[PDB]
Amino acid sequence: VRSQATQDLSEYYNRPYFDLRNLSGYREGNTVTFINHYQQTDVKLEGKDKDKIKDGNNENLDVFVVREGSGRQADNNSIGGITKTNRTQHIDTVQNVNLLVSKSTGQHTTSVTSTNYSIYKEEISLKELDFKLRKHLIDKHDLYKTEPKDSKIRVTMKNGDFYTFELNKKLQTHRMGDVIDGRNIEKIEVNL
């Protein structure tokens, strides 16, 4: 079975995305404007990111961009995904963590995939982790070819804190601007 709800998740997580690195964003109201090679990207702040981003100019940011509709209307602007850029613009990973994907393949059978997952950003948004991990799962683990049910991604930190992305719904918009230290990620576990 493939419900419309599942189909809508496939649609969302197949949206075009891009990223911008080490540039200024100018905040007016709750919208941050980025200009990169004369192209404008407006980003909506609607969570804790409202306390993080200053009114006016903010230097040396990165942004993970997922457009919310097509095209030019303001309600289609990307939401959250702003972080401070790395201390340097070096290309090396800043952390590497185990990614464990466990999938029920039958009544009595489970498949377990264990790989290294590279972290490049010192400060990373839940938006980016959510979108990119789902991309991995869609590509490699057939996510959304079946009903996701209670499947989830959990990102666990070195202090034992964790962050969960329930796969049967989009990441909540108010969580998209939440950020974490990528170097404090301990492991990532996915149950399918």
Ligand SMILES: CC(=O)N[C@@H]1[C@@H](O[C@@H]2O[C@@H](C)[C@@H](O)[C@@H](O)[C@@H]2O)[C@H](O[C@@H]2O[C@H](CO)[C@H](O)[C@H](O[C@]3(C(=O)O)C[C@H](O)[C@@H](NC(C)=O)[C@H]([C@H](O)[C@H](O)CO)O3)[C@H]2O)[C@@H](CO)O[C@@H]1O
């Ligand atoms: C009606 C509605 O949309 N309500 C949401 C909350 O979501 C509902 O309740 C949840 C408990 C869950 O049953 C969900 O399905 C309901 O729609 C939402 O609560 C968050 O939900 C997510 C899952 O979607 C997580 O369970 C999250 O908990 C954790 C997490 O695991 O990610 C707990 C964890 O301890 C905490 N980490 C800390 C404190 O270090 C994290 C962390 O705060 C966040 O991940 C940061 O974004 O959260 C539930 O908190 C709620 C909060 O987003 O908003 C509405 O009330």
Ligand SMILES: [K+]
């Ligand atoms: K359809």
Ligand SMILES: [K+]
């Ligand atoms: K590690």
Ligand SMILES: [K+]
């Ligand atoms: K099983």
